[PDB]
Amino acid sequence: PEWTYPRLSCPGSTFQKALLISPHRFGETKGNSAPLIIREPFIACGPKECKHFALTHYAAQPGGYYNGTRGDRNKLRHLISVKLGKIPTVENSIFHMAAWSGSACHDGKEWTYIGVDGPDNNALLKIKYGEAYTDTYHSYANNILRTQESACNCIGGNCYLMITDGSASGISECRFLKIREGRIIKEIFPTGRVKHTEECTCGFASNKTIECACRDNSYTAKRPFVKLNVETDTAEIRLMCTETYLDTPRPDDGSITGPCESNGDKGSGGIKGGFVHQRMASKIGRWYSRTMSKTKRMGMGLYVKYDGDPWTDSDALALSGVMVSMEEPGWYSFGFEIKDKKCDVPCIGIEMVHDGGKETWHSAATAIYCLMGSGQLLWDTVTGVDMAL
Amino acid sequence: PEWTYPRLSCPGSTFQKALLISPHRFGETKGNSAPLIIREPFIACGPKECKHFALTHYAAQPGGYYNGTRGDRNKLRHLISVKLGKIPTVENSIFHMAAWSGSACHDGKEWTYIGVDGPDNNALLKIKYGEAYTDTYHSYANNILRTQESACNCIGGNCYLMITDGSASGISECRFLKIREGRIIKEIFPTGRVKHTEECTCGFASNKTIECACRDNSYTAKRPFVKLNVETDTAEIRLMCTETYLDTPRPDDGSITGPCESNGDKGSGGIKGGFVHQRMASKIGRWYSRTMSKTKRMGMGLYVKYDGDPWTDSDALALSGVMVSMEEPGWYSFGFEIKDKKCDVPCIGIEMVHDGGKETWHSAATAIYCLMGSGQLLWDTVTGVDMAL
Amino acid sequence: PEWTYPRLSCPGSTFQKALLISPHRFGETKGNSAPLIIREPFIACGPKECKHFALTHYAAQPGGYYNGTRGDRNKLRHLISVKLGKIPTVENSIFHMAAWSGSACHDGKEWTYIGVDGPDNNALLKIKYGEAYTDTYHSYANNILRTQESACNCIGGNCYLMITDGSASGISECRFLKIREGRIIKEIFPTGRVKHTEECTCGFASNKTIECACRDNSYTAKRPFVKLNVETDTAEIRLMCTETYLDTPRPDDGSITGPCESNGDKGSGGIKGGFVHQRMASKIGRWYSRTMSKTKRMGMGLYVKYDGDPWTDSDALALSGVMVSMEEPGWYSFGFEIKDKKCDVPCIGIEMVHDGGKETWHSAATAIYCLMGSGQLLWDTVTGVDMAL
Amino acid sequence: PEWTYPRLSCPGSTFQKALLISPHRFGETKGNSAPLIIREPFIACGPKECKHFALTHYAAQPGGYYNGTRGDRNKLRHLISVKLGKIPTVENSIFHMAAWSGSACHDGKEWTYIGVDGPDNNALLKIKYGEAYTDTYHSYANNILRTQESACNCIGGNCYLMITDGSASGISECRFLKIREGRIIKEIFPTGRVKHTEECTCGFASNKTIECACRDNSYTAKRPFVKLNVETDTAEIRLMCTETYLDTPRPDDGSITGPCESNGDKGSGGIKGGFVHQRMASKIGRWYSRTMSKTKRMGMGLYVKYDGDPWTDSDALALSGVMVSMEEPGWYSFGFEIKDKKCDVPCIGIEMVHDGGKETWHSAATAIYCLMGSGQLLWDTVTGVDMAL
Ligand SMILES: *[C@@H]1O[C@H](CO)[C@@H](O[C@@H]2O[C@H](CO)[C@@H](O)[C@H](O)[C@H]2NC(C)=O)[C@H](O)[C@H]1NC(C)=O
Ligand SMILES: *[C@@H]1O[C@H](CO)[C@@H](O[C@@H]2O[C@H](CO)[C@@H](O)[C@H](O)[C@H]2NC(C)=O)[C@H](O)[C@H]1NC(C)=O
Ligand SMILES: *[C@@H]1O[C@H](CO)[C@@H](O[C@@H]2O[C@H](CO)[C@@H](O)[C@H](O)[C@H]2NC(C)=O)[C@H](O)[C@H]1NC(C)=O
Ligand SMILES: *[C@@H]1O[C@H](CO)[C@@H](O[C@@H]2O[C@H](CO)[C@@H](O)[C@H](O)[C@H]2NC(C)=O)[C@H](O)[C@H]1NC(C)=O
Ligand SMILES: CCC(CC)[C@H](NC(C)=O)[C@@H]1[C@H](O)[C@@H](C(=O)O)C[C@H]1NC(=N)N
Ligand SMILES: CCC(CC)[C@H](NC(C)=O)[C@@H]1[C@H](O)[C@@H](C(=O)O)C[C@H]1NC(=N)N
Ligand SMILES: CCC(CC)[C@H](NC(C)=O)[C@@H]1[C@H](O)[C@@H](C(=O)O)C[C@H]1NC(=N)N
Ligand SMILES: CCC(CC)[C@H](NC(C)=O)[C@@H]1[C@H](O)[C@@H](C(=O)O)C[C@H]1NC(=N)N
Ligand SMILES: [Ca+2]
Ligand SMILES: [Ca+2]
Ligand SMILES: [Ca+2]
Ligand SMILES: [Ca+2]
């Protein structure tokens, strides 16, 4: 089989609600099912199949191991998948590797799986190519080495991946790894605005360029925006100039005074953001998602911009529709691409966390919206879970 | 692999009881299983395999989410399948897409999946070709856009599908979509008696003609009868003339006074009806199913007519046997075709709803009868479920 | 792929304990599993794979549907399988068809499935070739038409199957059906001792002859013994002459006075018996199983005879070992053949029924012994189920 | 497909934590899962896939059959597998054969499965090639005939396996079987220090030599060390000379006075030990695991030695890291090899037994560490199970 490359996108001018995976709809005390407790879900597709990934706390609902499940990192957390459309339960799932931070992607021939574990002060990125554990990468700032929580991107067999290391409250200067058949064949050190880049959501703008919309957990509600040239293996990063700030928390739209590079206020904390390309013959569409609340992880709106340059564009993104209403959880979001026979379908996935605090179970549904047809986005997504059951 | 075409039917002159799928036989409080709560099941087959589809309420029995499950449309309802012969449970099932109205069919190369969701006033038909979301179609009468709840039909790669839009109590003028590799390549606007057509059950009479037996939810207990010419992509609709009225409710057989086109009385409400062709070298068999009760969704009898013209034939259909006795639920029914090595097996499927009102769970078994051998239909089907358990 | 033929058996001179499938070891009230309630298990293999068949009461343990489960025939009973080695549970199982009497076999290219249902006075044998329902056969004595409860046997694409019809207490004159790609291409009417033949266990003695060891439910504890010539499609039946009477109940060995054809006493009732061939270059081995108790369904011993003629041989069979001790249930038993790369492995399977009467659940484990190596049979099989749990 | 041969190992200089399979994390009373009760897990891989084997007590947690589950041998114990990464539950598992001692391995074309059962005084090794039961081997010392509890090793189609027979407290003189397409084509009788060899962990040092690190259950805390020449099918055994005694219990490192062959003290009892080769172009790495406690089955450290000769090397092994801390169970350990596209990944697996005595359930998690990247081993493995739940 042949290496995959980004293709022209399938025809379409709007996203529509596609699929909800709400495994805790079957988690009642009165029920008989074992959905896995998870967070940081993402989706990645090869030629034939999409897989729904997540980071489990290796516990189920109903169950006795709720405690710790609101936590980020421990020695039990694993990267798991199911084929997309299956409920990720104890039995349907496969456990790929120990991980408290993840990524995966298909290169046309095989699956690369990425999982970070280790102690906070010296963590370790591991790479699996199919069945074989294949390579590692070491902590360079000795402070919670970390990856995308979304799909890596492969072209001509060469798979690119964002990592970062550093204080979540401070300086976290990201790197990219060029990976081929599961082995690291180079490190790319971005230039430009590089002081804090987290959890990049990356995809192909063309055969020459990968672009990522990332999270600054410390200094700004603007998303750092990566442009990675895969011909030269060089990357530059600058803040998104759009007045439609995509992070949460954030201040009012347009309120960050001054030129594109201005950090502004209300920039502490953050959330991973969805971002996907629509590649047309002579026009590029960029689709983004952000929370409906400016302050809390509630709701998710979808946004679009055709052409321009996200580094210098001060104008608003166009609100394309409400995916998750203000009354429903809107947590992490991510882009991915489904492979049709002759073209690529852009989609956004949304993690809808069931959050009842540290004294209950802590897990998530995943909602999916994809480019399809014409017109306007029509319907929002609810999880339907009562956390008391 | 090659596109499929309708073939000559396998030899046979009677249907026989084939298979019951009664997932709630494993739904007891005292039990350990998770059958999905569903309705509107149907079956569709490719060359190798049949799939058993249904519209889930995304809830299981036993479970805490019974409430709403008697309802028709909500934001949780999804199109699901299992391979035919598997119990559609939480874990065996795959979730294809968000849908409160569905259809699917195989074209010889791949599966097309159809699901309608959206608000009642502006609903949306979505199309999936394998993994890829592929096209949409918009509400044209802004009143619960709707589809077959049974298999679409593909020939030479071209897959045809009935939709309708309009008041369930009033005018609902249906359309057909010609779909190819998941994309709509034309709309067909039927002529003739077109004031209310719902939930058509369609199949091939030949390589030139698709025929459908549909439901009039407002004006008549006679079934509107579609004839769609796939060479010219044109369709005409007229009422079935048979005295053996196939809808429920209905008046006594023969009691609708006057010529073929007369609407008659007791025509308010309705039920989707099974219908399948037996294609022979020089004779066509049409098999239909209708409820044993004239008024309630109880029982299911099978009926046949060889040759003639359902638009002008006033004679009775021949009662071929009792599939479901008067004492057992007989809800929706549908036709489909199993692909043998060299010929096609016609079958009727019957949805047997467990109905205990809005304050209990609301789901369904599926019974299957197929053409096989000679003689007379021998045995009826019971679900065996006690809804108190 | 090519049609299968019986081959020379793999080397070996003894059977050994191979595999127990005891699905009710996971059926506790305190447990979380759903093993299917079943009886009449058998096993059949193609080139790649063996399937473990049984007739379910469409109920699980734990569950609310125990009542009726001791019964032989009803409208819920179905033929199911799993790949051999899997626990036949609600979810692992596939439901092939409605059946209260069954058989299956692979012809090298595809699976033929056989299931009888219908009313007692007019029952119906149904045939499925892969997915397609394909043929039927009608009741000829209008009294519980019935089949093998073990594998049919295919050669050169032609699959042979024993059926019978008649009073279980009286005259039940069996027939054979020659089936090809799921269609009956002839009926064979045996000659000879034909007054009562039930539940034949059949296999290949050579490319020319199929042989069966059957049950007489009325007149004798000797097993009727079929020899079917597949070149001429003719069959003759005579009683087994061996003093080692293989039925249960039975009188003491050797106590049936007079010549081979003598019926003797203690012949009322019966049990289906295991029987398998070991085909060697210039010697034929016949392996049989019978209960350790002469009167009750307790224990199972394995027996062998090389060469001779079972119709005229008065000598004892050689006791080869105890498969199930006197203290464990020994119910139906059956032969089958596993396909190695170049040769065929003969095996006997034993149904070990959990019998606590009509007021508890009624189901069965399956024990498997196969030809393997040299020496002497070493270990017996226990089910390990406490029916109180 | 072609026979497999040992290849050059994938690049790497350290092991890292890869994967935990902790099926009892889903075994709570309050939960809905059925993990199998097991012990003696091991892993074996073919070209495409790794399988996770174990010896079940044919019981689940939660369940009613805990009693006996601390025991070594009974008539219910079976060899089971799942694909590596799946939770071995009642439904995910396949049951290969009755066994209370096991082994498996892939030869490039098919799976060989090994299982010993029988009475203690006359036990029986059985061999399965795919589906077919294929050969047996008899007890030669009439005292619990036994095998590796880890993978056999195939080269050019020829698969080698260690067995032993004899008193666990006394003389147990092991043998090797050369097996080809499931049939024993020779016995190899080792020479040298042969008085007690148990549970050898074997792999390829090269195309010419298999090496094993075994357990002496009676006379020494030094591991007997096998070198098997596959060209000549001859084997010699001597004690490991290293001061880093790999058995448990053991005395202080270096305390066994005298030359390499000295037995020393604290040698009664034992544990099976992990051992895997790293084959380089002109250097051989040997990786071993031993318990952190000198006396109890607690913790697991990983060790390495490059080149030398384990029979004559008195020097210490290099401590490479702590896989399981002193506070966590460290029971059996084993080596295996994952097949990358062009090279072989060495790994160690560790059985982490949940031991609460004979009056609770007795089962095990499996931890996996593999060669991957550079540097130092970073993280230990905990099971996370509270046996009270
Ligand atoms: C990027 O490059 C790929 C690979 O070169 C392009 O895919 C080719 O597209 C043409 C049809 O336009 C096919 O005939 C070739 O078979 C494809 N090659 C491969 C290796 O798949 C793709 O069109 C390019 N994508 C862009 C420009 O967006
Ligand atoms: C409808 O058309 C199809 C396709 O042309 C017919 O199928 C052909 O049947 C002949 C044998 O009668 C085969 O040799 C061809 O291979 C078939 N073609 C294809 C593309 O499958 C089919 O017989 C027709 N069905 C009718 C008339 O009912
Ligand atoms: C019965 O007939 C079959 C089919 O003719 C025999 O199988 C053949 O065996 C030879 C080797 O002895 C192979 O070269 C052929 O390929 C086989 N043919 C087929 C169609 O499989 C088989 O040996 C015979 N069995 C007996 C005599 O017991
Ligand atoms: C052991 O022998 C095998 C088989 O001969 C060697 O595998 C060969 O390796 C070369 C490349 O180095 C390939 O071109 C061949 O296709 C391989 N042959 C087979 C049959 O796989 C292997 O390199 C040897 N392993 C060692 C020396 O460790
Ligand atoms: C402290 C660094 C954070 C990234 C900005 C942190 N990442 C990790 C790997 O711990 C994320 C953050 O704390 C949590 C969130 O914001 O939802 C999830 C959390 N992500 C994961 N648990 N994998
Ligand atoms: C109001 C329009 C009706 C069609 C005539 C209605 N269709 C939908 C899509 O809501 C059906 C009808 O109300 C119910 C029935 O008759 O059983 C099922 C119901 N079908 C579905 N829930 N999919
Ligand atoms: C009354 C005729 C009997 C055959 C001799 C009878 N067969 C059927 C099809 O009902 C069997 C017999 O009654 C029971 C037994 O002997 O175990 C099983 C039973 N077999 C099945 N339930 N399939
Ligand atoms: C008495 C001989 C022992 C080998 C040294 C013994 N082997 C068997 C087959 O019974 C092992 C030992 O008793 C137990 C242990 O040490 O953990 C496991 C146990 N292994 C198994 N139950 N398969
Ligand atoms: Ca921020
Ligand atoms: Ca009507
Ligand atoms: Ca008898
Ligand atoms: Ca020792």
GROMACS .gro file of N, CA and C in nm, chain C residues 74-158:
model
  255
  852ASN      N    1  -4.014  -2.535   2.105
  852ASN     CA    2  -4.101  -2.417   2.122
  852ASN      C    3  -4.069  -2.319   2.008
  853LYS      N    4  -4.136  -2.204   2.003
  853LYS     CA    5  -4.119  -2.105   1.895
  853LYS      C    6  -4.000  -2.008   1.912
  854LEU      N    7  -3.928  -2.019   2.024
  854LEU     CA    8  -3.812  -1.934   2.053
  854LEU      C    9  -3.676  -2.000   2.026
  855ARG      N   10  -3.672  -2.133   2.038
  855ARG     CA   11  -3.550  -2.213   2.019
  855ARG      C   12  -3.481  -2.177   1.884
  856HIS      N   13  -3.348  -2.150   1.884
  856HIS     CA   14  -3.269  -2.115   1.762
  856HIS      C   15  -3.138  -2.191   1.754
  857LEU      N   16  -3.091  -2.219   1.631
  857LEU     CA   17  -2.955  -2.268   1.607
  857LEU      C   18  -2.856  -2.151   1.617
  858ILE      N   19  -2.758  -2.165   1.706
  858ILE     CA   20  -2.654  -2.064   1.723
  858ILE      C   21  -2.514  -2.125   1.707
  859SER      N   22  -2.415  -2.040   1.678
  859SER     CA   23  -2.275  -2.080   1.691
  859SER      C   24  -2.183  -1.972   1.747
  860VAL      N   25  -2.067  -2.019   1.790
  860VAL     CA   26  -1.947  -1.938   1.812
  860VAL      C   27  -1.832  -2.014   1.746
  861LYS      N   28  -1.722  -1.945   1.716
  861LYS     CA   29  -1.599  -2.015   1.678
  861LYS      C   30  -1.563  -2.104   1.796
  862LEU      N   31  -1.517  -2.227   1.770
  862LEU     CA   32  -1.481  -2.319   1.880
  862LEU      C   33  -1.368  -2.262   1.967
  863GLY      N   34  -1.387  -2.265   2.098
  863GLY     CA   35  -1.294  -2.201   2.189
  863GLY      C   36  -1.348  -2.073   2.253
  864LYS      N   37  -1.454  -2.016   2.195
  864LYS     CA   38  -1.522  -1.899   2.254
  864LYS      C   39  -1.635  -1.943   2.348
  865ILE      N   40  -1.664  -1.867   2.453
  865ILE     CA   41  -1.780  -1.899   2.538
  865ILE      C   42  -1.910  -1.851   2.466
  866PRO      N   43  -2.003  -1.945   2.439
  866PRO     CA   44  -2.124  -1.903   2.369
  866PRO      C   45  -2.214  -1.823   2.463
  867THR      N   46  -2.199  -1.691   2.456
  867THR     CA   47  -2.276  -1.598   2.539
  867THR      C   48  -2.372  -1.524   2.449
  868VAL      N   49  -2.459  -1.441   2.509
  868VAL     CA   50  -2.551  -1.352   2.435
  868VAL      C   51  -2.479  -1.274   2.324
  869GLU      N   52  -2.358  -1.227   2.353
  869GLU     CA   53  -2.291  -1.136   2.261
  869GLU      C   54  -2.195  -1.203   2.163
  870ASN      N   55  -2.126  -1.308   2.208
  870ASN     CA   56  -2.035  -1.384   2.122
  870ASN      C   57  -2.106  -1.466   2.014
  871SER      N   58  -2.228  -1.507   2.045
  871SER     CA   59  -2.305  -1.597   1.958
  871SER      C   60  -2.361  -1.530   1.836
  872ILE      N   61  -2.378  -1.608   1.728
  872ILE     CA   62  -2.460  -1.564   1.617
  872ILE      C   63  -2.583  -1.655   1.611
  873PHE      N   64  -2.698  -1.598   1.578
  873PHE     CA   65  -2.823  -1.673   1.566
  873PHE      C   66  -2.847  -1.699   1.419
  874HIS      N   67  -2.837  -1.825   1.379
  874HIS     CA   68  -2.848  -1.861   1.238
  874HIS      C   69  -2.991  -1.868   1.188
  875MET      N   70  -3.080  -1.925   1.269
  875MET     CA   71  -3.218  -1.945   1.229
  875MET      C   72  -3.298  -2.006   1.341
  876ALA      N   73  -3.430  -1.987   1.334
  876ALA     CA   74  -3.524  -2.053   1.423
  876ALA      C   75  -3.514  -2.204   1.402
  877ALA      N   76  -3.491  -2.279   1.511
  877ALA     CA   77  -3.475  -2.424   1.506
  877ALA      C   78  -3.489  -2.489   1.642
  878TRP      N   79  -3.559  -2.601   1.643
  878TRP     CA   80  -3.561  -2.684   1.762
  878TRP      C   81  -3.496  -2.819   1.736
  879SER      N   82  -3.442  -2.834   1.615
  879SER     CA   83  -3.358  -2.949   1.580
  879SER      C   84  -3.257  -2.901   1.476
  880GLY      N   85  -3.129  -2.935   1.491
  880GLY     CA   86  -3.026  -2.879   1.401
  880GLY      C   87  -2.918  -2.967   1.341
  881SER      N   88  -2.846  -2.910   1.243
  881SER     CA   89  -2.725  -2.967   1.183
  881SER      C   90  -2.650  -2.856   1.106
  882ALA      N   91  -2.518  -2.871   1.090
  882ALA     CA   92  -2.439  -2.785   0.998
  882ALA      C   93  -2.316  -2.860   0.945
  883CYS      N   94  -2.253  -2.803   0.844
  883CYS     CA   95  -2.135  -2.864   0.782
  883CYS      C   96  -2.082  -2.767   0.678
  884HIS      N   97  -1.951  -2.772   0.654
  884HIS     CA   98  -1.882  -2.690   0.555
  884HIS      C   99  -1.844  -2.779   0.436
  885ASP      N  100  -1.857  -2.730   0.314
  885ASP     CA  101  -1.828  -2.811   0.195
  885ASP      C  102  -1.692  -2.778   0.127
  886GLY      N  103  -1.613  -2.695   0.195
  886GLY     CA  104  -1.487  -2.643   0.140
  886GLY      C  105  -1.497  -2.498   0.095
  887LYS      N  106  -1.618  -2.455   0.059
  887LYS     CA  107  -1.641  -2.320   0.004
  887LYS      C  108  -1.731  -2.239   0.094
  888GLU      N  109  -1.829  -2.304   0.155
  888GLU     CA  110  -1.925  -2.231   0.236
  888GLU      C  111  -1.995  -2.321   0.338
  889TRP      N  112  -2.060  -2.258   0.436
  889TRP     CA  113  -2.134  -2.324   0.542
  889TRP      C  114  -2.280  -2.351   0.504
  890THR      N  115  -2.324  -2.475   0.523
  890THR     CA  116  -2.466  -2.508   0.514
  890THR      C  117  -2.521  -2.520   0.658
  891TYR      N  118  -2.631  -2.450   0.688
  891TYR     CA  119  -2.693  -2.459   0.819
  891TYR      C  120  -2.832  -2.522   0.808
  892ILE      N  121  -2.864  -2.614   0.899
  892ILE     CA  122  -2.992  -2.686   0.895
  892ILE      C  123  -3.070  -2.664   1.024
  893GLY      N  124  -3.195  -2.624   1.010
  893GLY     CA  125  -3.279  -2.605   1.127
  893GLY      C  126  -3.424  -2.644   1.104
  894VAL      N  127  -3.476  -2.728   1.192
  894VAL     CA  128  -3.617  -2.769   1.184
  894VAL      C  129  -3.698  -2.689   1.283
  895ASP      N  130  -3.806  -2.629   1.235
  895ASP     CA  131  -3.911  -2.580   1.322
  895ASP      C  132  -4.048  -2.610   1.262
  896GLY      N  133  -4.152  -2.560   1.326
  896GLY     CA  134  -4.290  -2.582   1.283
  896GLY      C  135  -4.373  -2.647   1.393
  897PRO      N  136  -4.504  -2.670   1.367
  897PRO     CA  137  -4.583  -2.745   1.462
  897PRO      C  138  -4.542  -2.894   1.456
  898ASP      N  139  -4.564  -2.966   1.566
  898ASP     CA  140  -4.526  -3.107   1.574
  898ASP      C  141  -4.586  -3.190   1.459
  899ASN      N  142  -4.710  -3.159   1.421
  899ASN     CA  143  -4.780  -3.237   1.321
  899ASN      C  144  -4.743  -3.201   1.177
  900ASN      N  145  -4.662  -3.097   1.157
  900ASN     CA  146  -4.626  -3.057   1.022
  900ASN      C  147  -4.501  -2.972   1.020
  901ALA      N  148  -4.391  -3.029   1.068
  901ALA     CA  149  -4.271  -2.949   1.091
  901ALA      C  150  -4.189  -2.931   0.961
  902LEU      N  151  -4.088  -2.845   0.967
  902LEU     CA  152  -4.024  -2.801   0.844
  902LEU      C  153  -3.873  -2.786   0.859
  903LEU      N  154  -3.799  -2.855   0.772
  903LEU     CA  155  -3.655  -2.845   0.770
  903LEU      C  156  -3.614  -2.732   0.675
  904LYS      N  157  -3.530  -2.643   0.725
  904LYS     CA  158  -3.488  -2.525   0.652
  904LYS      C  159  -3.339  -2.534   0.632
  905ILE      N  160  -3.294  -2.482   0.519
  905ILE     CA  161  -3.154  -2.484   0.481
  905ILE      C  162  -3.104  -2.344   0.445
  906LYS      N  163  -2.989  -2.311   0.501
  906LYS     CA  164  -2.926  -2.183   0.483
  906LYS      C  165  -2.787  -2.209   0.428
  907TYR      N  166  -2.752  -2.142   0.319
  907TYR     CA  167  -2.618  -2.153   0.262
  907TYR      C  168  -2.552  -2.017   0.283
  908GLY      N  169  -2.463  -2.008   0.382
  908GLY     CA  170  -2.408  -1.879   0.423
  908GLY      C  171  -2.521  -1.795   0.478
  909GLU      N  172  -2.543  -1.680   0.416
  909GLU     CA  173  -2.645  -1.584   0.457
  909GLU      C  174  -2.783  -1.619   0.402
  910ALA      N  175  -2.785  -1.685   0.287
  910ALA     CA  176  -2.909  -1.708   0.212
  910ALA      C  177  -2.986  -1.832   0.260
  911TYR      N  178  -3.113  -1.810   0.294
  911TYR     CA  179  -3.211  -1.917   0.308
  911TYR      C  180  -3.242  -1.967   0.169
  912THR      N  181  -3.240  -2.099   0.154
  912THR     CA  182  -3.204  -2.161   0.030
  912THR      C  183  -3.301  -2.276  -0.010
  913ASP      N  184  -3.344  -2.357   0.087
  913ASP     CA  185  -3.439  -2.467   0.059
  913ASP      C  186  -3.518  -2.510   0.183
  914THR      N  187  -3.625  -2.586   0.161
  914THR     CA  188  -3.693  -2.656   0.271
  914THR      C  189  -3.729  -2.801   0.237
  915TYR      N  190  -3.761  -2.877   0.341
  915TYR     CA  191  -3.810  -3.014   0.327
  915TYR      C  192  -3.926  -3.036   0.427
  916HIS      N  193  -4.031  -3.103   0.379
  916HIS     CA  194  -4.156  -3.119   0.453
  916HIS      C  195  -4.167  -3.248   0.532
  917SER      N  196  -4.249  -3.243   0.638
  917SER     CA  197  -4.282  -3.358   0.721
  917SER      C  198  -4.352  -3.464   0.639
  918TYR      N  199  -4.298  -3.587   0.642
  918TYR     CA  200  -4.353  -3.699   0.565
  918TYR      C  201  -4.430  -3.800   0.649
  919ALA      N  202  -4.419  -3.789   0.781
  919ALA     CA  203  -4.498  -3.877   0.870
  919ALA      C  204  -4.573  -3.795   0.973
  920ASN      N  205  -4.568  -3.662   0.956
  920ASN     CA  206  -4.650  -3.570   1.035
  920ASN      C  207  -4.639  -3.589   1.186
  921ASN      N  208  -4.516  -3.615   1.230
  921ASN     CA  209  -4.490  -3.638   1.371
  921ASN      C  210  -4.346  -3.602   1.406
  922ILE      N  211  -4.328  -3.473   1.434
  922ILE     CA  212  -4.202  -3.415   1.478
  922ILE      C  213  -4.087  -3.450   1.382
  923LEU      N  214  -4.095  -3.404   1.257
  923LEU     CA  215  -3.978  -3.411   1.166
  923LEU      C  216  -3.851  -3.355   1.236
  924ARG      N  217  -3.738  -3.421   1.215
  924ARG     CA  218  -3.623  -3.417   1.306
  924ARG      C  219  -3.491  -3.438   1.232
  925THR      N  220  -3.380  -3.386   1.284
  925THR     CA  221  -3.250  -3.416   1.223
  925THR      C  222  -3.140  -3.459   1.325
  926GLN      N  223  -3.014  -3.458   1.281
  926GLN     CA  224  -2.903  -3.525   1.349
  926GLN      C  225  -2.863  -3.472   1.488
  927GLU      N  226  -2.875  -3.341   1.510
  927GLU     CA  227  -2.807  -3.273   1.623
  927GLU      C  228  -2.655  -3.291   1.620
  928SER      N  229  -2.600  -3.304   1.498
  928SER     CA  230  -2.455  -3.315   1.474
  928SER      C  231  -2.424  -3.287   1.327
  929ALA      N  232  -2.296  -3.284   1.291
  929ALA     CA  233  -2.257  -3.233   1.158
  929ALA      C  234  -2.300  -3.319   1.038
  930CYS      N  235  -2.347  -3.252   0.933
  930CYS     CA  236  -2.369  -3.318   0.804
  930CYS      C  237  -2.231  -3.342   0.743
  931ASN      N  238  -2.224  -3.414   0.632
  931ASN     CA  239  -2.095  -3.451   0.578
  931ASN      C  240  -2.091  -3.422   0.429
  932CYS      N  241  -1.994  -3.342   0.386
  932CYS     CA  242  -1.985  -3.302   0.247
  932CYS      C  243  -1.864  -3.364   0.178
  933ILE      N  244  -1.883  -3.402   0.052
  933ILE     CA  245  -1.777  -3.458  -0.031
  933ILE      C  246  -1.798  -3.409  -0.173
  934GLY      N  247  -1.695  -3.352  -0.235
  934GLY     CA  248  -1.704  -3.303  -0.372
  934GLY      C  249  -1.813  -3.198  -0.395
  935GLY      N  250  -1.855  -3.131  -0.287
  935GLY     CA  251  -1.968  -3.035  -0.288
  935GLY      C  252  -2.104  -3.091  -0.249
  936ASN      N  253  -2.112  -3.223  -0.237
  936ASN     CA  254  -2.237  -3.291  -0.207
  936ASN      C  255  -2.245  -3.322  -0.061
   0.00000   0.00000   0.00000
